[PDB]
Amino acid sequence: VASYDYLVIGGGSGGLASARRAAELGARAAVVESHKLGGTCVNVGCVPKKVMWNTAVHSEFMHDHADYGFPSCEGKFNWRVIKEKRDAYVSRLNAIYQNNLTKSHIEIIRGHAAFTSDPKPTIEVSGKKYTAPHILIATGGMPSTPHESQIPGASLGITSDGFFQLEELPGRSVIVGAGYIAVEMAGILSALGSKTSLMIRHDKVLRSFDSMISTNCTEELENAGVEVLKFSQVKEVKKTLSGLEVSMVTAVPGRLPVMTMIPDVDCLLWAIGRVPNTKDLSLNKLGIQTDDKGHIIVDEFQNTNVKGIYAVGDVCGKALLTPVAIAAGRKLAHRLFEYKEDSKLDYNNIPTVVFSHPPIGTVGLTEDEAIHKYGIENVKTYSTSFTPMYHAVTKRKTKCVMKMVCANKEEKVVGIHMQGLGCDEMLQGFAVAVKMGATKADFDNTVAIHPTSSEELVTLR
């Protein structure tokens, strides 16, 4: 049995960030990875999604070209061109990630790890055993898909993994779900020319976001040509002569339910959540606790129920974002190898951007969460809605909406929510201010930058 100071199972965002910081602190560390270094972020997530988002953004600016004084463009998009370049960039990052590990003197162990039944926690990979006093599980997640028993033909649909294998633009797309991936993917496909429907169980997308965002985002999808099918769910999927036929039930409250078939569908995309990757770890051999979905249960320091075993990232099922996995991983390394007993990630005030069109930025509490926490007499909100001056000269319009949620007599800024051109790059600095405990006076006494969209946040009344 080979002993290390730190053994990390999974070479994605959280595992790599933790292993790298531990190694800097002198730990002899090893990372086990069964597939590609960089994990979801690099291979089938953040990075290739952002490339496609930039592509979809080009398409929108193509629409405004004539408005801005140029000749209009015909613009038949070639999916194969950008796909090849996107894959090449992913390959470059895979190589960079490997180099980063080698330079940090971290051993890479290739294969699938599972725990053994040995007294002290030990893993096996390809018949060889490894142990350490500290073992991090950072195995991430995978897309959730319906069971064929519940939805016949569900396996004819793809997930976000399959989206990145597509080699041509689907003519007709149906996306099912109402969260991050559904919104981003519908925006990409629609902007690039697919006839796109988004099928959602209720009346709005992103229902866990502030109501102003959920409402505005649903409107913006419609305005961009996405057909939003409300109160609708898939009943069955059949392979026909010319693509898939999707049977759906629409059940609007106060009406009779109605069944419709959607013919000639080229791509059906399930975007209904993620499930943790823990089934094949043999967690039961050590009695590591999981919830009913398979997430590893941790305390505020990322400890599992077993001494010397930790978990970070998507596998724990909380705030499923690349930078959260990285920050939790790094804080854990400082606790273990720098002996900072109080080193942990604060899960409050995590900012997030949804790469819709226009993009959404949010940090902190929604108006409803604030009312629940502080009481309705203690919450004040300020908001504005305007058309960005980019569109002063265009026939196409998008809106910018911004809301600030303040609490108590001082009007501490407890939440900021916005959607609009530029909001993807606008949010980070406001999130620092929110984290520091800014009040509305702190915003108001900062001098504006003009003419920008961002200055509206410091001049709310």
Ligand X SMILES: NC(=O)C1=CN([C@@H]2O[C@H](COP(=O)(O)OP(=O)(O)OC[C@H]3O[C@@H](n4cnc5c(N)ncnc54)[C@H](OP(=O)(O)O)[C@@H]3O)[C@@H](O)[C@H]2O)C=CC1
Ligand Y SMILES: Cc1cc2nc3c(=O)[nH]c(=O)nc-3n(C[C@H](O)[C@H](O)[C@H](O)COP(=O)(O)OP(=O)(O)OC[C@H]3O[C@@H](n4cnc5c(N)ncnc54)[C@H](O)[C@@H]3O)c2cc1C
The verdict on 82 binding a copy of itself (CB under 8 A) reads: yes
The verdict on 322 binding a copy of itself (CB under 8 A) reads: yes
- Whole-number Å distance between alpha carbons of 313 and 237: 34
Token pair recorded at residue 248: 């759906």
In terms of DSSP bridges, do strands 2-3 and 128-131 run parallel, antiparallel, or are they unpaired? parallel
Partner in contact with 325, chosen from ligand Y, ligand X, a copy of itself, none, beta carbon below 5 to 8 Å by kind: ligand Y
For residue 304, the minimal CB distance to ligand X (Å) is 21
Nearest to 206 by CA among 193, 220, 195: 220
The verdict on 277 binding ligand Y (CB under 6 A) reads: yes
Partner in contact with 313, chosen from ligand X, a copy of itself, ligand Y, none, beta carbon below 5 to 8 Å by kind: ligand Y
The verdict on 273 binding ligand X (CB under 6 A) reads: yes
| Bond preceding residue 451 cis, omega within 30 of 0 | yes
Rounded alpha-carbon distances, angstroms, from residue 212 to 140, 366, 417, 419, 430: 31, 9, 8, 9, 19
For residue 381, the minimal CB distance to ligand Y (Å) is 26
| Bond preceding residue 358 cis, omega within 30 of 0 | yes
Would the annotation count 251 as a binding residue? Answer: no
- Whole-number Å distance between alpha carbons of 37 and 174: 31
The verdict on 95 binding a copy of itself (CB under 8 A) reads: no
In the region spanning residues 291 to 350, those forming contacts with ligand Y, defined by CB under 6 A, are: 313-315, 320-323, 325
Cite the DSSP H helix spans in 27-130: 39-44, 46-64, 79-103
User: Residue 437 gets which letter from DSSP?
Assistant: T
Would the annotation count 314 as a binding residue? Answer: yes
The verdict on 358 binding ligand Y (CB under 6 A) reads: no
Sheet of strand 309-311: strand arrangement? 107-110, 29-33, 6-9, 135-137, 309-311
Q: Which stretch binds ligand X (CB under 6 A): 250-258, 351-359, 378-386, 407-415?
A: 351-359
Q: Which of 105, 377, 392, 395 binds a copy of itself (CB under 8 A)?
A: 392
Q: Which of 1, 2, 35, 61 binds a copy of itself (CB under 8 A)?
A: 61
CB atoms within 10 A of CB 296: 26
The verdict on 243 binding ligand X (CB under 6 A) reads: no
Q: Binding site, residues? A: 13-14, 20, 33, 40-41, 49, 97, 113, 178, 181, 184, 201, 207, 273, 314, 320, 322, 330, 353, 450
> Applying CB under 6 A, which residues contact ligand Y?
9-15, 32-35, 39-41, 45-46, 49, 112-113, 138-140, 160, 181, 277, 280-281, 313-315, 320-323, 325, 450
